[PDB]
Amino acid sequence: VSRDTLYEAVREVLHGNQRKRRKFLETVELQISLKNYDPQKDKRFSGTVRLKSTPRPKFSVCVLGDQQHCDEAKAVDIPHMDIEALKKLNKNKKLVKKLAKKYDAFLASESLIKQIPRILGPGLNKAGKFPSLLTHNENMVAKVDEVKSTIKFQMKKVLCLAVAVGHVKMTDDELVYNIHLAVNFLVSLLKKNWQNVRALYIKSTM
Amino acid sequence: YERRAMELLKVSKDKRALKFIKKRVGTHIRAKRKREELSSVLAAMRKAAAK
RNA sequence: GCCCGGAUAGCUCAGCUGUAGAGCAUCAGACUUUUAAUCUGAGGGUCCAGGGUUCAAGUCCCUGUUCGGGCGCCA
RNA sequence: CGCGACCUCAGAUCAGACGUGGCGACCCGCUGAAUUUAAGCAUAUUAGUCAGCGGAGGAAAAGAAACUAACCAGGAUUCCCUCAGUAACGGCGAGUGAACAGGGAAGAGCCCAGCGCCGAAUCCCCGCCCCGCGGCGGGGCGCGGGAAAUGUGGCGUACGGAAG
RNA sequence: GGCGCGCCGGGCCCGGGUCUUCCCGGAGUCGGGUUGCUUGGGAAUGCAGCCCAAAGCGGGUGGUAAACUCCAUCUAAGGCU
RNA sequence: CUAACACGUGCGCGAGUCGGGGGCUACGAAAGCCGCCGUGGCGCAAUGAAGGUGAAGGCCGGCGGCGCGCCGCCGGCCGAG
RNA sequence: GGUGUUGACGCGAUGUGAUUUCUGCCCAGUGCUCUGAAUGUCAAAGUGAAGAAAUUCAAUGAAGCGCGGGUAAACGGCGGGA
RNA sequence: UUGACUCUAGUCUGGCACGGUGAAGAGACAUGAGAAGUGUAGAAUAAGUGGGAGGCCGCCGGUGAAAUACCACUACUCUGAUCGUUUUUUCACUGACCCGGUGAGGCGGGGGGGCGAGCCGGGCUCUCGCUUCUGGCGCCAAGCGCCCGGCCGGCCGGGCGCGACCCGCUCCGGGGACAGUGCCAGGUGGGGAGUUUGACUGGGGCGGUACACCUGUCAAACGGUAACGCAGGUGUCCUAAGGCGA
Ligand SMILES: [Mg+2]
Ligand SMILES: [Mg+2]
Ligand SMILES: [Mg+2]
Ligand SMILES: [Mg+2]
Ligand SMILES: [Mg+2]
Ligand SMILES: [Mg+2]
Ligand SMILES: [Mg+2]
Ligand SMILES: [Mg+2]
Ligand SMILES: [Mg+2]
Ligand SMILES: [Mg+2]
Ligand SMILES: [Mg+2]
Ligand SMILES: [Mg+2]
Ligand SMILES: [Mg+2]
Ligand SMILES: [Mg+2]
Ligand SMILES: [Mg+2]
Ligand SMILES: [Mg+2]
Ligand SMILES: [Mg+2]
Ligand SMILES: [Mg+2]
Ligand SMILES: [Mg+2]
Ligand SMILES: [Mg+2]
Ligand SMILES: [Mg+2]
Ligand SMILES: [Mg+2]
Ligand SMILES: [Mg+2]
Ligand SMILES: [Mg+2]
Ligand SMILES: [Mg+2]
Ligand SMILES: [Mg+2]
Ligand SMILES: [Mg+2]
Ligand SMILES: [Mg+2]
Ligand SMILES: [Mg+2]
Ligand SMILES: [Mg+2]
Ligand SMILES: [Mg+2]
Ligand SMILES: [Mg+2]
Ligand SMILES: [Mg+2]
Ligand SMILES: [Mg+2]
Ligand SMILES: [Mg+2]
Incomplete structure (x- = not known):
């Protein structure tokens, strides 16, 4: 699609x-509707994108190191x-799926994902909230920021998606470049x- | 013929709309180009009915 | 070969998330002179095999034999 | 109803012009057979040939790429040597059959419509004056008539071009 | 007759480089289907009838039909020599 | 009689060969000349449908390798049945 | 354009050949004509599906064949053995 | 000539184009409006995805679950109906198109008028609009009204309107988006076209195959050797009737 549609729709949502x-906590969302993609047969897609704009920022972090x-x-x-707390929250998975419902996403240590697939x-x-593996920088500052906003474009059996991109206070040509990254990926x-x-929609939480 | 192709694109039958334009124009390249400019025209009509 | 249709207990069929059901046949009991006919009921499926989506599929989607059907060849 | 514009269309022994027909060796457009060959014959071959028809010129046609190429790239058309009896076509039978490249003959390039900007800046015709007149042309004057805005002329054409 | 030369009357008052801003193209045609002829041109080289009938980083060509993706090359459907 | 092919024979040159087409200078439209006019033909290379490939070898010295006495690779020698 | 300056007491297409007396039997075949509705077959164009597309496949199905009535002053035909 | 081969003008049928305007009937759809979303566990009638921390005066928890609850702005299916896209059948319309008539002569409305209908001189609906005893005649306007000019109320020649209504968009009728033509496709097609209609042979034809092969003979003791010489055979058959071993 042309970019001027994005420009006028997003300036209209700022003064709309x-x-x-x-x-x-105001934030807006993208919404997807697909034409004729078969949800049932093979080559169903699940692509995560390294978006470097972080449109969430009210975001919840708890890791494993x-x-x-x-x-x-x-x-x-x-x-x-x-690893003692790993075994502690392993003692009753009801409490860590509360914790999975408390916070947004997890981060993974280097070696302890043999200790994770035990039970x-x-x-x-x-x-769907699997932790993200570290790298041998061993520096979590901006690595958790490049772990967040790795957006899961996902194909489930319904022909609809919606992508949480955009909050009302960020910079504006960077918003239309954010949504441009979303739509071209x-x-x-x-x-x-x-x-x-x-039909790609960009309308807000309300 | 392009009105009838816009009816097929409004009902979103892209394959039969492409086969229709491919018959009633010529080459598959001209078929694809005219199908995509009719899709742009029909999208502009949807936005005109929107706001 | 081809979309297509099908598999369900020894034999015909029903049946979107679990007691796989309706009968036919067998087993054993009661009746009867005796399972001859009746009747009471039970036993009896790795749902054709495998993978996949799903909260789990005998049911949805694929893959793999096996058959039932018109065309393809042949004069 | 009458008058006046314009538009479509008629009639003139109206003013001025123009085409007809001929020859047709060479040339352009169309039409176009069967003999013949295949040891027969029907596809092919004869053959886009004979016959037919139309149209020109001193030459005609072609011609300045919606090209050849696939290279270190050439560069309108036409003609000759070659490519080559090759690639190819064909009851793949008989038979048919180019072009590119290279060497030569010759060699030449250009103009519109459109996009535009200039007060239609443009063109034809009648009358008179001067000149010249056996290729009716040059200069001047006409409150002379037309054409043209439904588009003439000047710059401009893909090699870009225009304005400041 | 033409090449030489002089005099009058009349036409034109013309160019090139750089920078900035503009502007740019030919349609029942191209192309496709089918049919017939022609071609060496072979899943159709050219021509024509009928039907469909466009585009503008478009369109044609790139000698085996077609899809995708790069390249290369020209600018058709107007005209003179 | 023209064209094509084959073989024989004469002539010139000979791994070359030929200007036939173009050009330069009465008989003579002949004749001569070109050579950075051999473009080109035919020959000098065959084979394969095609991608393609494309016409002697040996000996010496050094460095079963194992139940390349063959030899892989390097320097020399002989060198064309 | 002829029939046609015509209109079924006409135009066109056939057979047989005055009159008298008759004109028998056969629709199986080959024709001709009538009807479209069982199973068939059946073109291009149109429709749907599969595929990246050329293309492939399926469905529907015009007349004509098929199938079925009628017709011999239509072509023709019209037995034997004890 | 035809029941030969391969085709052909003609004709029959289908498709496309010229090729329209409506109204109903049957559908397929698109769209707006409206309710459905009952395996369980769970206060529960959870279809699904994604955001979400206070709208408005249930919720963030926690509970059971695979998955949760305000809002919206989405995407799927289902069930009645409004509305505009196409197909299809039928009935119509006139405008392309075809036919007929003519010296293209009164067409369609409306007005004005005369005979009938009944309701209390009235309007409406409908019809009519002047020619029938005769082998005659029939045009080139009488009459009315209003203007006008030449000569002196009188004379002579004029012009206009009613008579002969007005208004209009096809000259009137008959057909009609089918006839028809243009282009394809299928059928039919001795009406017409082009051609073919083997060979051997005691002439040719009919017969036969002596035309491709096989055995014995002929065949004269190598091989070879003929006629339509002689007596015969073949165009197959076999999962064993092939190959071993006993
Ligand atoms: Mg005159
Ligand atoms: Mg012959
Ligand atoms: Mg002969
Ligand atoms: Mg002959
Ligand atoms: Mg020819
Ligand atoms: Mg001639
Ligand atoms: Mg002439
Ligand atoms: Mg002359
Ligand atoms: Mg010329
Ligand atoms: Mg050339
Ligand atoms: Mg040669
Ligand atoms: Mg042959
Ligand atoms: Mg030829
Ligand atoms: Mg050349
Ligand atoms: Mg030269
Ligand atoms: Mg000019
Ligand atoms: Mg101009
Ligand atoms: Mg040019
Ligand atoms: Mg011809
Ligand atoms: Mg021709
Ligand atoms: Mg030919
Ligand atoms: Mg040009
Ligand atoms: Mg040109
Ligand atoms: Mg010319
Ligand atoms: Mg010889
Ligand atoms: Mg010799
Ligand atoms: Mg008779
Ligand atoms: Mg009789
Ligand atoms: Mg009969
Ligand atoms: Mg007879
Ligand atoms: Mg025949
Ligand atoms: Mg015939
Ligand atoms: Mg004949
Ligand atoms: Mg004979
Ligand atoms: Mg002997």
């Missing part, structure tokens, strides 16, 4: 905050999960291009 002048993670995690307000790996891989993720999407 006048609809409610909302009470909440090695050692050298203790002082830096308790310094910069990151929950260092030890808690199959226990809480049934939420969506269309290039699909097995067929722009004919395969019926």
